[PDB]
Amino acid sequence: GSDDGAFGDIWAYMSEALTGAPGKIIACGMLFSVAYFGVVKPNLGLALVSALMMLVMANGEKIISSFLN
Amino acid sequence: GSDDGAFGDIWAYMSEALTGAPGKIIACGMLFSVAYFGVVKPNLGLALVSALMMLVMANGEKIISSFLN
Amino acid sequence: GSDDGAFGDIWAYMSEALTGAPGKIIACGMLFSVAYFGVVKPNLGLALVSALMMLVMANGEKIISSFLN
Amino acid sequence: GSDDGAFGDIWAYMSEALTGAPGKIIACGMLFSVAYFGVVKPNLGLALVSALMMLVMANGEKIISSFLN
Amino acid sequence: GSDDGAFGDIWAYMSEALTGAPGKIIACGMLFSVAYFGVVKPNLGLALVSALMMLVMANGEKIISSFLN
Amino acid sequence: GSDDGAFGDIWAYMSEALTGAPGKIIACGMLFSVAYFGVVKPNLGLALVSALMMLVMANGEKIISSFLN
Amino acid sequence: GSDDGAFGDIWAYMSEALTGAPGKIIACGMLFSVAYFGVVKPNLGLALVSALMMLVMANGEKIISSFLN
Amino acid sequence: GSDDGAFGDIWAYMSEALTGAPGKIIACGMLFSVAYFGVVKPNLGLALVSALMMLVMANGEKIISSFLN
Amino acid sequence: GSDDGAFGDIWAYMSEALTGAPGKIIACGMLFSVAYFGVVKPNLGLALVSALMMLVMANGEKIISSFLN
Amino acid sequence: GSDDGAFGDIWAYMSEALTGAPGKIIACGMLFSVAYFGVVKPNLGLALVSALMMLVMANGEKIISSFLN
Amino acid sequence: GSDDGAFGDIWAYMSEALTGAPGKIIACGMLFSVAYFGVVKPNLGLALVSALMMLVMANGEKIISSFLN
Amino acid sequence: GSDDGAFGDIWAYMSEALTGAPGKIIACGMLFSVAYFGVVKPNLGLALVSALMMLVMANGEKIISSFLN
Amino acid sequence: GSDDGAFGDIWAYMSEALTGAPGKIIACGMLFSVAYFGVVKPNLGLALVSALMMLVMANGEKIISSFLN
Amino acid sequence: GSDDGAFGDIWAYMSEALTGAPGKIIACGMLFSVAYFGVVKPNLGLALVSALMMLVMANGEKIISSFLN
Amino acid sequence: GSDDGAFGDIWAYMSEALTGAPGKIIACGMLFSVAYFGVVKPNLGLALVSALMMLVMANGEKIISSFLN
Amino acid sequence: GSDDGAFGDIWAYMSEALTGAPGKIIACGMLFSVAYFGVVKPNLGLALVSALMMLVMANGEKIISSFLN
Amino acid sequence: GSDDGAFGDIWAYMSEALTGAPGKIIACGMLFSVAYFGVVKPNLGLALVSALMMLVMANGEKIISSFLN
Amino acid sequence: GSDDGAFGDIWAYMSEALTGAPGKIIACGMLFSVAYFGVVKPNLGLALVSALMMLVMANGEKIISSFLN
Amino acid sequence: GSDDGAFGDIWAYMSEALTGAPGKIIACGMLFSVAYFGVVKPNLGLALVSALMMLVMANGEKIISSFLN
Amino acid sequence: GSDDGAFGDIWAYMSEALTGAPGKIIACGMLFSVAYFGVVKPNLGLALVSALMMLVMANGEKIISSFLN
Ligand SMILES: CCCCCCCCCCCCCCCC(=O)OC[C@H](COP(=O)(O)OC[C@@H](O)CO)OC(=O)CCCCCCCCCCCCCCC
Ligand SMILES: CCCCCCCCCCCCCCCC(=O)OC[C@H](COP(=O)(O)OC[C@@H](O)CO)OC(=O)CCCCCCCCCCCCCCC
Ligand SMILES: CCCCCCCCCCCCCCCC(=O)OC[C@H](COP(=O)(O)OC[C@@H](O)CO)OC(=O)CCCCCCCCCCCCCCC
Ligand SMILES: CCCCCCCCCCCCCCCC(=O)OC[C@H](COP(=O)(O)OC[C@@H](O)CO)OC(=O)CCCCCCCCCCCCCCC
């Protein structure tokens, strides 16, 4: 596909924000949720799942650009 | 069918945008939704479903042109 | 990614609070839970798991910044 | 981390209560449980485990402040 | 720690009851258990263990106050 | 806080009933439950837990007034 | 607390029944359970535990009235 | 306590059956168990324990009525 | 922010009631719920959670004023 | 964009009220809702979500001014 | 309050029926439900809960008249 | 209460059926369930519980009429 | 506010009926609903909620007169 | 604005009635609705919402006079 | 009770089947289970328990008719 | 069946990815899960099950093409 | 029935696609789901169920043509 | 299979981390668990099992690449 | 493998603590357990096993780094 | 290893108590056990084993510090 056009700025902003401040806020939210739900049931596997989700978000732009040319 | 006519430009724009900036914006939206809903309930299966939907969108023009000659 | 923008202040507050007062409150909550659940079934392994979770929270900002540039 | 902020009072109360009246109540609960479960199966090792848990609670604030700056 | 506060009365009651009527009831329960289990297998070592547990309960408040300031 | 106002009567009634007839009914309910569940599995520890809950209810008004000024 | 009010009759009935017909039915149930489970594994300690539970039920009203004024 | 009321008939039936047909069936069950388990390991002490349990059942109503007035 | 204006009286009333009669009524409601749900499943951890919620309500005005200037 | 014009006063009032008395009233409403819904199901995660929403409201004017120049 | 007026007859009928034929029908329904659900999972605690609900219904008119003068 | 009225026939039918054909069908159902679940895990205690439930059903009308006048 | 005027009689009637015959009818309706829904799922907590609602209705006139002068 | 003029009497009457007899009638209507809808689904949160609406009505004149000079 | 009515045929069928073909099938199932579980752990006591259960089923109709008139 | 058509590209991508990067990511996820859950309960049988699942995925395309011609 | 008509082409396409590219895509989806859900809970029975579903899809056209002539 | 594509980076990161910092953290966790559970029950066989699991993790990438081409 | 990355600090802390204060605490715990269990059954072989476990912990980092490159 | 850190105080307390009051209490316990078990079977070899265990405890800190640097 083409990255430019009438919606090029929106796509650029969303792609940059996926690994930018909103993405970091979401990742911190998952970290806080893992810490909170581990108070009664300590489970560090959810931390690994959160790290994997962060890795997926880090590669989200690449995946989207690969699937949608 | 025929790709030209009075509505040929609209069809061309929509087909190009399916894998263009609007399609990439929608895919980034699904990625953001997967990241957000994984804060409380980490689920990477929805990421696989999102990737499959992106693959379907990448082949949407081919499917439409195959069904509608 | 970029730490600034419209959501830079929210990200800064969340990152500082991960090891700040809310994070310390959550850690004290896990300590209280470990103490309480050890009344009937004394288990100091959950204390080690809680310490590991505290260590993970101490490095949460670094992990998030590493995954999300 | 920082001990002050909007949640500074909650953190201060929880840290003081870890070795305060609630912590002493929990420790007395473990002592009562050790005494009760020793009626049929006298086991003074659980008393040592309870003392170790009390020692951990006495150092809980230090551990939390060390892990979370 | 501090013995006063919202939970000061509960802590005072529990500490007084550790060597009070509930503690004496538990100690009498261990004595009855030692007498009963000695019908088929006479074992006076369990009586010594019960006496040691009673001594521990007599010093439980001191231990709790020493560990939790 | 303030004990008076439009909701002062409701607060007074609830605080008096916490140690009044409804609280005594709830405590008798826990006693009945302890007696019933001890038919198949005799467990006098639940009686101690029930006594501790009764002690907490006896101090519930004090705790609420201490936390909420 | 106060024994009268809208719930005074319910509290009176429950307190009287704790040592009345329902309490005697529950005690007979524990006696039947002790007799039945002693067919394969004769254990008279459970009879002592049942007697202690009956003694606790006999003093349940006093304990409730002492904790809840 | 009071033997009458809505549950008086149930209490009367249970008390009469403790030394009635169900109690005799349970006692015969213990006798059969003692005879069966003595085939490989002849042990007449379990017969004495069974006789003591029968004596306890014979006095179960008296014990229940003494504890629960 | 500013505490005055057309809605200053409403904000003042709500902030005072957070630790006033309505807040005390809600806290007594949580105490009653903890007592009631402990009849069948005695759990004193919910009492600790209720105390933590009361502490949060005691600092709710401070948190709101800190976040919203 | 431009903050002045025929609608400049309305925009100024709304932006000031986002962190002013109406915003504080809404935040107190979320605190009251968290306290009320925690009576039956104690959940302190909703308190964290409410704090995050308060933080978002504190930065709402900045986000709006960043997106809309 | 006042028991007379335009709605006095309806209130009288409802209060009399609370312990009358409709109330007895509802109580028999709970007895039937307890008997039916005990076929697969025999549980006599639900019978005690049903008896307590019947006792509450017997005092429902008194409670209503006490709360609503 | 009163046994007559518009719902007197329904109450009479339900009370008669509690010990009539539907009650006997339910009791036979519990007997069948006890026999079936004893194929893999022979347990005659559930038979005693079923007999107690049958005794309760036999006195259900008396209990209902005693609680609801 | 003022209790008199063209609508003074309507306000007086409604305030008197809040704790009068209509209010008692509504309270009896909640009691009937609690009894009915407890046939399949015995829950006495809803009875406590109904009692709290009755207490609120008993103080409804006071609350209305306090808020609306 | 100005409170006098040809419509000054109408404005005065409406402002006085907002907290007068019509406002009290409306508040009693919300109380009756909360009581009625709580018969099947007991919900005391709607009572809090009604109290907040009453508080808003108590300050309605102030808000109107602040917005409209 | 009465054996006739709308449910008389169902009761007759169930009572006849308790000692009929379904009851014999269940008894054969217990015999097969005893034979199978005795392959690794030969235990003829379970055969005695199965015979006692068969005897109980043979008298199930009599017990049901005695309890439920 | 036929591998071509409008959906031929999607089928080709999914079949290649079953043993490609997504399949390898899933297999690494199972390896990580086996390693993590073996920290507390070391179990190498789950590793064998994971290897069998990897073997099944390696033959998944063949199985699908065999069943669906 | 008849395979021809106005809808003959649609029926032919659907029947061919049941074992064609869409059916293979669905089967690959079940394989991916089995692989993914086996990361935390390795279960190869779901693979057998998926194979059975693939076999059913392979015979779906035959079943449809047999039922609908 | 193919190691490249849209998910090539995720696969590379996971494969490198299997023997990298996360894998070493998991191995240290198993070592800590072996040391902790050996305090009461010294068992060095679990150390051998942990070493075997570490060896399996060291060869996990090779196994995955062998099964999934 | 690589010792650095987002999880490098956690790995460094865990490796240093294996032979640091937590490891020494665990070793002292095994020494205390050996001393305590030797009161009734003096066994110095468990001391040798504890020394071997301490030696294994001293080489745990080397083993982990050797297996996981 | 390092003796300081978040767990330095716990390690210091445990090391000092190994030869302190708890260690002396354990040694006195072994002496009492040796004296008691020598009543029927006088054996002074167990005294030598106890002395060797005391010597091991005296050197426990040195051994732990030597193995764990
Ligand atoms: C006041 C005295 C000092 C506090 C003493 C105890 C503190 C509680 C911790 C020990 C309880 C352990 C046994 C629990 C018994 C139990 O079953 O708990 C159940 C309850 C619900 O937790 P989850 O939602 O994880 O549970 C789901 C199910 O378990 C429901 O039962 O757990 C908690 O709420 C405790 C965690 C709160 C701890 C984190 C608090 C920090 C976050 C909030 C910070 C403030 C937010 C402010 C926003 C403005
Ligand atoms: C009044 C007389 C003095 C008290 C005497 C006994 C005190 C109880 C301790 C010994 C019982 C041991 C045998 C138990 C038998 C048993 O099975 O218990 C079961 C019960 C449930 O505990 P968990 O939820 O850990 O158990 C889950 C399963 O075990 C359920 O059975 O344990 C407790 O509640 C005891 C711990 C409370 C002790 C900590 C209390 C301090 C926290 C609360 C402080 C106040 C909060 C105020 C909030 C406003
Ligand atoms: C009435 C006559 C005087 C009492 C005579 C005997 C008293 C019982 C002691 C000897 C029995 C020994 C053989 C037991 C045979 C046996 O197997 O017991 C089993 C039973 C269950 O105990 P655990 O839960 O420790 O056992 C778990 C498993 O052993 C289950 O079998 O043990 C007890 O309940 C006895 C301890 C109660 C003793 C402590 C009572 C004091 C706490 C309660 C104080 C009142 C609370 C009031 C709350 C309102
Ligand atoms: C009439 C004879 C004297 C009463 C004898 C027995 C009383 C019941 C207690 C022992 C039963 C134990 C075994 C239960 C078996 C069981 O499974 O129960 C289940 C039932 C439901 O409780 P939860 O909702 O906690 O349970 C959720 C799940 O467990 C559902 O199964 O528990 C209760 O209702 C008992 C608690 C009521 C006790 C508190 C009553 C006081 C509050 C009401 C006061 C009056 C309100 C008036 C409003 C106008």
Ligand SMILES: CCCCCCCCCCCCCCCC(=O)OC[C@H](COP(=O)(O)OC[C@@H](O)CO)OC(=O)CCCCCCCCCCCCCCC
């Ligand atoms: C009719 C003949 C005379 C009765 C003979 C036997 C009576 C039963 C006692 C011995 C059985 C022991 C072996 C059981 C075998 C067994 O596994 O039982 C399981 C069953 C379920 O009890 P729980 O809910 O404690 O058990 C949970 C799990 O154990 C489920 O298996 O226990 C009972 O129901 C027995 C307790 C009832 C005894 C208390 C009855 C008094 C309360 C009701 C009073 C009337 C209420 C009226 C309301 C209107």
Ligand SMILES: CCCCCCCCCCCCCCCC(=O)OC[C@H](COP(=O)(O)OC[C@@H](O)CO)OC(=O)CCCCCCCCCCCCCCC
């Ligand atoms: C028909 C021939 C005459 C009977 C001969 C033998 C009778 C059985 C006694 C000796 C077996 C000993 C070896 C058992 C081998 C064995 O392992 O048994 C296991 C089985 C299960 O008992 P528990 O639940 O105590 O065992 C739990 C675990 O041991 C499970 O294995 O024990 C019984 O059921 C025997 C007790 C029944 C005896 C009491 C019966 C009276 C109560 C029922 C009265 C009728 C109720 C009617 C309700 C409507």
Ligand SMILES: CCCCCCCCCCCCCCCC(=O)OC[C@H](COP(=O)(O)OC[C@@H](O)CO)OC(=O)CCCCCCCCCCCCCCC
């Ligand atoms: C009169 C006697 C003294 C009161 C005794 C009991 C008080 C109730 C608390 C314990 C019940 C626990 C078991 C409940 C059983 C249960 O399932 O409850 C269900 C019911 C509905 O709550 P939610 O909407 O959270 O539940 C949604 C679902 O759970 C529906 O079932 O919970 C409540 O209403 C209780 C909370 C009220 C407590 C807060 C009251 C304070 C707010 C109102 C203040 C006055 C407003 C005035 C406005 C003018």
Ligand SMILES: CCCCCCCCCCCCCCCC(=O)OC[C@H](COP(=O)(O)OC[C@@H](O)CO)OC(=O)CCCCCCCCCCCCCCC
């Ligand atoms: C970044 C560091 C390297 C990763 C380290 C760890 C990786 C995680 C595996 C071990 C965690 C084990 C303990 C879990 C603890 C646990 O309870 O997990 C719960 C969580 C939810 O799984 P389910 O939905 O099967 O669980 C349902 C319930 O278990 C909810 O708790 O499991 C997973 O998400 C792990 C499986 C993901 C593994 C497959 C990932 C590959 C698919 C995605 C590929 C990318 C898609 C891209 C789309 C664009």
Ligand SMILES: CCCCCCCCCCCCCCCC(=O)OC[C@H](COP(=O)(O)OC[C@@H](O)CO)OC(=O)CCCCCCCCCCCCCCC
């Ligand atoms: C690295 C150094 C060379 C290895 C040295 C030792 C190897 C371990 C054998 C001796 C330990 C004996 C004492 C154990 C102490 C012990 O209690 O073990 C407990 C542990 C759990 O086994 P189970 O599940 O049979 O035990 C259930 C309960 O025993 C739990 O305690 O046993 C094993 O895991 C050992 C068997 C693994 C041996 C088979 C491994 C081959 C299968 C895996 C092949 C690779 C799969 C790859 C998949 C991708």
Ligand SMILES: CCCCCCCCCCCCCCCC(=O)OC[C@H](COP(=O)(O)OC[C@@H](O)CO)OC(=O)CCCCCCCCCCCCCCC
């Ligand atoms: C690749 C190397 C060669 C394989 C080596 C090992 C093969 C695994 C067998 C030994 C593991 C034993 C220890 C297990 C440890 C263990 O706990 O396992 C747990 C796991 C779950 O089994 P269940 O669901 O029976 O277990 C329920 C609970 O046990 C959960 O833990 O068991 C299996 O999956 C093994 C059975 C699969 C064996 C049957 C496979 C054939 C069916 C599939 C055929 C293909 C379907 C294709 C569909 C398209």
Ligand SMILES: CCCCCCCCCCCCCCCC(=O)OC[C@H](COP(=O)(O)OC[C@@H](O)CO)OC(=O)CCCCCCCCCCCCCCC
């Ligand atoms: C800070 C001091 C240094 C750490 C000391 C101890 C470390 C803990 C290991 C020994 C505890 C053994 C006794 C446990 C007592 C126990 O019962 O544990 C229970 C707890 C829950 O584990 P599972 O979910 O396997 O257990 C299910 C049930 O066992 C629940 O009880 O186990 C763990 O969490 C320990 C495994 C974590 C170890 C792996 C950590 C590496 C993965 C995370 C890496 C970071 C992720 C970052 C994401 C951003």
Ligand SMILES: CCCCCCCCCCCCCCCC(=O)OC[C@H](COP(=O)(O)OC[C@@H](O)CO)OC(=O)CCCCCCCCCCCCCCC
């Ligand atoms: C540091 C000083 C040099 C070591 C001196 C002594 C070494 C210990 C041998 C003699 C003790 C004999 C009396 C024991 C007294 C005794 O009762 O022991 C009990 C203990 C438990 O063994 P089992 O599980 O066979 O016993 C089950 C029951 O006996 C439990 O009591 O035995 C061992 O652990 C000793 C065998 C370890 C020897 C094999 C070690 C090699 C495998 C581990 C290699 C490293 C793995 C690294 C993984 C990363």
Ligand SMILES: CCCCCCCCCCCCCCCC(=O)OC[C@H](COP(=O)(O)OC[C@@H](O)CO)OC(=O)CCCCCCCCCCCCCCC
């Ligand atoms: C204060 C005085 C100095 C301490 C004296 C005694 C220390 C205890 C050791 C000897 C007791 C032996 C007899 C026990 C009797 C017994 O049965 O214990 C049972 C208890 C439970 O252990 P497991 O979970 O292995 O046991 C499972 C079953 O055995 C449950 O009974 O064992 C321990 O907790 C002792 C191990 C703790 C030792 C390791 C502590 C170091 C890890 C924690 C470091 C701090 C974490 C901080 C996190 C922030």
